[PDB]
Amino acid sequence: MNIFEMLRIDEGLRLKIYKDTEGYYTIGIGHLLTKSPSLNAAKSELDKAIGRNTNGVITKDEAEKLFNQDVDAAVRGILRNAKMKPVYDSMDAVRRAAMINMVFQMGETGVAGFTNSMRMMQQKRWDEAAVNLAKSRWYNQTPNRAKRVITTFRTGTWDAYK
Ligand SMILES: [Cl-]
Ligand SMILES: [Cl-]
């Protein structure tokens, strides 16, 4: 188990444009294309990202290539963030994977509003942090994913994903 396999389970894999859980156009392994309601807008975004006229469809290989860039960006986004970096650096490998999961799904921004949970994380008060993470739109909207990520932080194991 690792970050790749971990996200691949949370996000699934789809080769045509689809709407995510928030109703936004996505493709591949959770690669958000655009927040706009326009499909054309999405298809343009798509062609720009892939580098060709896709017509809303891509190959597995292209999916994977977006996914790689996106995991990388997530990481680096974290390392570049003054509030997150230190939290992340205080943690072990599993728990780091969980934070990158969050950052991947909700962006640097979304994750940055878990200030309180992060402070607990940094203090290593796991069960408390787990409780606090649950009090969130995030948990209320995608509860099963949320629970998985939360178990991961609380336990420091991959149990929720095995
Ligand atoms: Cl891109
Ligand atoms: Cl869910």
PDB file of C-alpha atoms and ligand atoms in Angstrom:
ATOM      1  CA  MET A   1       0.000   0.000   0.000  1.00  0.00           C
ATOM      2  CA  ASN A   2       1.027   3.495  -0.878  1.00  0.00           C
ATOM      3  CA  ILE A   3      -0.329   6.856  -1.862  1.00  0.00           C
ATOM      4  CA  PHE A   4      -0.920   5.847  -5.396  1.00  0.00           C
ATOM      5  CA  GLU A   5      -2.859   2.732  -4.580  1.00  0.00           C
ATOM      6  CA  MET A   6      -4.517   4.581  -1.757  1.00  0.00           C
ATOM      7  CA  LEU A   7      -5.844   7.342  -3.961  1.00  0.00           C
ATOM      8  CA  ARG A   8      -6.664   5.004  -6.747  1.00  0.00           C
ATOM      9  CA  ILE A   9      -9.109   3.328  -4.447  1.00  0.00           C
ATOM     10  CA  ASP A  10     -10.651   6.494  -3.153  1.00  0.00           C
ATOM     11  CA  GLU A  11     -11.045   8.143  -6.594  1.00  0.00           C
ATOM     12  CA  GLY A  12     -11.679   5.275  -8.980  1.00  0.00           C
ATOM     13  CA  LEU A  13     -10.739   5.445 -12.647  1.00  0.00           C
ATOM     14  CA  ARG A  14     -12.850   6.860 -15.455  1.00  0.00           C
ATOM     15  CA  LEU A  15     -12.035   7.540 -18.998  1.00  0.00           C
ATOM     16  CA  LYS A  16     -14.770   9.912 -20.020  1.00  0.00           C
ATOM     17  CA  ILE A  17     -15.565  13.226 -18.496  1.00  0.00           C
ATOM     18  CA  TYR A  18     -17.854  12.776 -15.482  1.00  0.00           C
ATOM     19  CA  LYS A  19     -19.199  14.845 -12.634  1.00  0.00           C
ATOM     20  CA  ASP A  20     -17.597  14.471  -9.335  1.00  0.00           C
ATOM     21  CA  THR A  21     -19.457  14.391  -6.031  1.00  0.00           C
ATOM     22  CA  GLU A  22     -19.711  18.225  -6.056  1.00  0.00           C
ATOM     23  CA  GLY A  23     -21.140  18.091  -9.611  1.00  0.00           C
ATOM     24  CA  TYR A  24     -17.918  19.249 -11.292  1.00  0.00           C
ATOM     25  CA  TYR A  25     -16.370  17.906 -14.418  1.00  0.00           C
ATOM     26  CA  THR A  26     -13.625  15.494 -13.838  1.00  0.00           C
ATOM     27  CA  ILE A  27     -11.840  12.685 -15.622  1.00  0.00           C
ATOM     28  CA  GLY A  28      -9.243  10.019 -14.970  1.00  0.00           C
ATOM     29  CA  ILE A  29      -8.251   9.447 -11.399  1.00  0.00           C
ATOM     30  CA  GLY A  30     -10.019  12.329  -9.765  1.00  0.00           C
ATOM     31  CA  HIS A  31      -8.480  14.958 -11.995  1.00  0.00           C
ATOM     32  CA  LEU A  32     -10.688  17.999 -11.692  1.00  0.00           C
ATOM     33  CA  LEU A  33     -11.073  19.743 -14.918  1.00  0.00           C
ATOM     34  CA  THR A  34     -13.033  22.826 -14.145  1.00  0.00           C
ATOM     35  CA  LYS A  35     -15.629  24.177 -11.772  1.00  0.00           C
ATOM     36  CA  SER A  36     -17.694  25.691 -14.505  1.00  0.00           C
ATOM     37  CA  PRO A  37     -20.990  24.285 -15.542  1.00  0.00           C
ATOM     38  CA  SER A  38     -19.898  24.241 -19.165  1.00  0.00           C
ATOM     39  CA  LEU A  39     -18.969  21.042 -20.780  1.00  0.00           C
ATOM     40  CA  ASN A  40     -17.197  22.715 -23.581  1.00  0.00           C
ATOM     41  CA  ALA A  41     -15.180  24.583 -21.115  1.00  0.00           C
ATOM     42  CA  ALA A  42     -14.296  21.193 -19.652  1.00  0.00           C
ATOM     43  CA  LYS A  43     -13.463  19.667 -22.950  1.00  0.00           C
ATOM     44  CA  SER A  44     -11.208  22.559 -23.686  1.00  0.00           C
ATOM     45  CA  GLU A  45      -9.498  22.193 -20.363  1.00  0.00           C
ATOM     46  CA  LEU A  46      -9.156  18.604 -21.166  1.00  0.00           C
ATOM     47  CA  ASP A  47      -7.455  19.099 -24.474  1.00  0.00           C
ATOM     48  CA  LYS A  48      -5.133  21.607 -23.036  1.00  0.00           C
ATOM     49  CA  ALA A  49      -4.071  19.247 -20.362  1.00  0.00           C
ATOM     50  CA  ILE A  50      -3.536  16.228 -22.534  1.00  0.00           C
ATOM     51  CA  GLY A  51      -2.018  18.072 -25.407  1.00  0.00           C
ATOM     52  CA  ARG A  52      -4.417  16.859 -28.096  1.00  0.00           C
ATOM     53  CA  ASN A  53      -8.003  16.772 -29.388  1.00  0.00           C
ATOM     54  CA  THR A  54      -9.476  14.249 -27.122  1.00  0.00           C
ATOM     55  CA  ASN A  55     -13.140  14.710 -27.606  1.00  0.00           C
ATOM     56  CA  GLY A  56     -13.785  14.098 -23.842  1.00  0.00           C
ATOM     57  CA  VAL A  57     -12.059  10.756 -23.882  1.00  0.00           C
ATOM     58  CA  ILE A  58      -8.593   9.702 -22.874  1.00  0.00           C
ATOM     59  CA  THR A  59      -6.604   6.514 -22.525  1.00  0.00           C
ATOM     60  CA  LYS A  60      -5.512   4.748 -19.364  1.00  0.00           C
ATOM     61  CA  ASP A  61      -1.989   5.865 -19.958  1.00  0.00           C
ATOM     62  CA  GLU A  62      -3.045   9.549 -20.165  1.00  0.00           C
ATOM     63  CA  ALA A  63      -5.131   9.072 -16.983  1.00  0.00           C
ATOM     64  CA  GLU A  64      -2.154   7.815 -15.219  1.00  0.00           C
ATOM     65  CA  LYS A  65      -0.016  10.567 -16.439  1.00  0.00           C
ATOM     66  CA  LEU A  66      -2.435  13.177 -15.077  1.00  0.00           C
ATOM     67  CA  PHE A  67      -2.536  11.260 -11.851  1.00  0.00           C
ATOM     68  CA  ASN A  68       1.226  11.360 -11.442  1.00  0.00           C
ATOM     69  CA  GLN A  69       1.392  15.059 -12.003  1.00  0.00           C
ATOM     70  CA  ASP A  70      -1.424  15.541  -9.637  1.00  0.00           C
ATOM     71  CA  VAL A  71       0.110  13.518  -6.789  1.00  0.00           C
ATOM     72  CA  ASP A  72       3.336  15.414  -7.219  1.00  0.00           C
ATOM     73  CA  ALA A  73       1.623  18.802  -7.206  1.00  0.00           C
ATOM     74  CA  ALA A  74      -0.182  17.793  -3.994  1.00  0.00           C
ATOM     75  CA  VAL A  75       3.041  16.975  -2.276  1.00  0.00           C
ATOM     76  CA  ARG A  76       4.787  20.044  -3.360  1.00  0.00           C
ATOM     77  CA  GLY A  77       1.820  22.158  -2.568  1.00  0.00           C
ATOM     78  CA  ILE A  78       2.134  20.875   1.023  1.00  0.00           C
ATOM     79  CA  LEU A  79       5.867  21.408   1.259  1.00  0.00           C
ATOM     80  CA  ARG A  80       5.382  24.909   0.023  1.00  0.00           C
ATOM     81  CA  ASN A  81       2.781  25.713   2.635  1.00  0.00           C
ATOM     82  CA  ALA A  82       4.029  27.315   5.804  1.00  0.00           C
ATOM     83  CA  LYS A  83       1.219  26.082   7.885  1.00  0.00           C
ATOM     84  CA  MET A  84       1.218  22.548   6.554  1.00  0.00           C
ATOM     85  CA  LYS A  85       4.827  21.709   6.085  1.00  0.00           C
ATOM     86  CA  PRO A  86       5.624  21.430   9.665  1.00  0.00           C
ATOM     87  CA  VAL A  87       2.650  19.318  10.374  1.00  0.00           C
ATOM     88  CA  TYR A  88       3.510  17.000   7.604  1.00  0.00           C
ATOM     89  CA  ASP A  89       7.145  16.840   8.613  1.00  0.00           C
ATOM     90  CA  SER A  90       6.181  15.832  12.108  1.00  0.00           C
ATOM     91  CA  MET A  91       4.393  12.695  10.920  1.00  0.00           C
ATOM     92  CA  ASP A  92       5.223   9.123   9.902  1.00  0.00           C
ATOM     93  CA  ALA A  93       4.818   7.757   6.423  1.00  0.00           C
ATOM     94  CA  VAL A  94       1.325   6.436   6.657  1.00  0.00           C
ATOM     95  CA  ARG A  95      -0.077   9.511   8.179  1.00  0.00           C
ATOM     96  CA  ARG A  96       1.649  11.634   5.586  1.00  0.00           C
ATOM     97  CA  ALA A  97      -0.136   9.643   2.945  1.00  0.00           C
ATOM     98  CA  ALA A  98      -3.366  10.546   4.594  1.00  0.00           C
ATOM     99  CA  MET A  99      -2.665  14.216   4.474  1.00  0.00           C
ATOM    100  CA  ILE A 100      -1.698  14.124   0.878  1.00  0.00           C
ATOM    101  CA  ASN A 101      -5.071  12.298   0.281  1.00  0.00           C
ATOM    102  CA  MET A 102      -6.867  15.243   1.793  1.00  0.00           C
ATOM    103  CA  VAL A 103      -4.863  17.758  -0.109  1.00  0.00           C
ATOM    104  CA  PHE A 104      -5.462  15.928  -3.311  1.00  0.00           C
ATOM    105  CA  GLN A 105      -9.157  15.807  -2.866  1.00  0.00           C
ATOM    106  CA  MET A 106      -9.742  19.256  -1.611  1.00  0.00           C
ATOM    107  CA  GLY A 107      -6.884  21.469  -2.444  1.00  0.00           C
ATOM    108  CA  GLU A 108      -4.390  23.382  -0.372  1.00  0.00           C
ATOM    109  CA  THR A 109      -7.087  25.717   0.618  1.00  0.00           C
ATOM    110  CA  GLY A 110      -9.664  23.220   1.718  1.00  0.00           C
ATOM    111  CA  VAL A 111      -7.026  21.502   3.865  1.00  0.00           C
ATOM    112  CA  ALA A 112      -5.764  24.671   5.370  1.00  0.00           C
ATOM    113  CA  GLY A 113      -9.183  25.178   7.274  1.00  0.00           C
ATOM    114  CA  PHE A 114      -8.448  22.150   9.444  1.00  0.00           C
ATOM    115  CA  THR A 115      -6.219  24.310  11.556  1.00  0.00           C
ATOM    116  CA  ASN A 116      -7.396  22.904  14.746  1.00  0.00           C
ATOM    117  CA  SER A 117      -7.208  19.314  13.681  1.00  0.00           C
ATOM    118  CA  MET A 118      -3.687  19.973  12.411  1.00  0.00           C
ATOM    119  CA  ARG A 119      -2.520  21.386  15.661  1.00  0.00           C
ATOM    120  CA  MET A 120      -3.723  18.180  17.285  1.00  0.00           C
ATOM    121  CA  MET A 121      -2.070  16.274  14.638  1.00  0.00           C
ATOM    122  CA  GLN A 122       1.135  17.986  15.307  1.00  0.00           C
ATOM    123  CA  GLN A 123       0.765  17.346  19.038  1.00  0.00           C
ATOM    124  CA  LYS A 124       0.025  13.699  18.128  1.00  0.00           C
ATOM    125  CA  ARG A 125      -3.342  13.557  19.849  1.00  0.00           C
ATOM    126  CA  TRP A 126      -4.789  11.148  17.367  1.00  0.00           C
ATOM    127  CA  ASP A 127      -8.118  10.151  18.760  1.00  0.00           C
ATOM    128  CA  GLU A 128      -8.869  13.765  19.400  1.00  0.00           C
ATOM    129  CA  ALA A 129      -7.828  14.838  16.018  1.00  0.00           C
ATOM    130  CA  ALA A 130     -10.001  12.056  14.486  1.00  0.00           C
ATOM    131  CA  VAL A 131     -12.973  13.408  16.329  1.00  0.00           C
ATOM    132  CA  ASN A 132     -12.347  16.947  15.245  1.00  0.00           C
ATOM    133  CA  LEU A 133     -11.807  15.955  11.582  1.00  0.00           C
ATOM    134  CA  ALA A 134     -15.290  14.407  11.586  1.00  0.00           C
ATOM    135  CA  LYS A 135     -16.954  17.721  12.390  1.00  0.00           C
ATOM    136  CA  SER A 136     -16.720  18.905   8.844  1.00  0.00           C
ATOM    137  CA  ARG A 137     -18.687  19.316   5.675  1.00  0.00           C
ATOM    138  CA  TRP A 138     -16.078  16.996   4.207  1.00  0.00           C
ATOM    139  CA  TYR A 139     -17.035  14.161   6.437  1.00  0.00           C
ATOM    140  CA  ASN A 140     -20.772  14.881   5.998  1.00  0.00           C
ATOM    141  CA  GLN A 141     -20.496  14.850   2.224  1.00  0.00           C
ATOM    142  CA  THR A 142     -18.182  11.898   1.525  1.00  0.00           C
ATOM    143  CA  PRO A 143     -18.386  10.006   4.719  1.00  0.00           C
ATOM    144  CA  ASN A 144     -16.995   6.629   3.655  1.00  0.00           C
ATOM    145  CA  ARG A 145     -13.834   8.166   2.148  1.00  0.00           C
ATOM    146  CA  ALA A 146     -13.591  10.458   5.076  1.00  0.00           C
ATOM    147  CA  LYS A 147     -13.804   7.550   7.531  1.00  0.00           C
ATOM    148  CA  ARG A 148     -11.038   5.748   5.684  1.00  0.00           C
ATOM    149  CA  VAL A 149      -8.719   8.750   5.807  1.00  0.00           C
ATOM    150  CA  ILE A 150      -9.598   9.382   9.443  1.00  0.00           C
ATOM    151  CA  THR A 151      -8.874   5.785  10.490  1.00  0.00           C
ATOM    152  CA  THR A 152      -5.601   6.152   8.782  1.00  0.00           C
ATOM    153  CA  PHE A 153      -4.625   9.164  10.800  1.00  0.00           C
ATOM    154  CA  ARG A 154      -5.866   7.743  14.037  1.00  0.00           C
ATOM    155  CA  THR A 155      -4.196   4.404  13.625  1.00  0.00           C
ATOM    156  CA  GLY A 156      -1.108   5.120  11.647  1.00  0.00           C
ATOM    157  CA  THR A 157      -1.928   1.840   9.676  1.00  0.00           C
ATOM    158  CA  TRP A 158      -3.430   0.888   6.225  1.00  0.00           C
ATOM    159  CA  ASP A 159      -6.126  -1.198   7.864  1.00  0.00           C
ATOM    160  CA  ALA A 160      -8.955   0.822   6.440  1.00  0.00           C
ATOM    161  CA  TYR A 161      -7.755   0.183   3.045  1.00  0.00           C
ATOM    162  CA  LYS A 162      -7.069  -3.562   3.276  1.00  0.00           C
TER     163      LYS A 162
HETATM  164 CL    CL B   1      -3.032  19.978 -15.825  1.00  0.00          CL
HETATM  165 CL    CL B   2     -17.765   8.653   0.338  1.00  0.00          CL
END
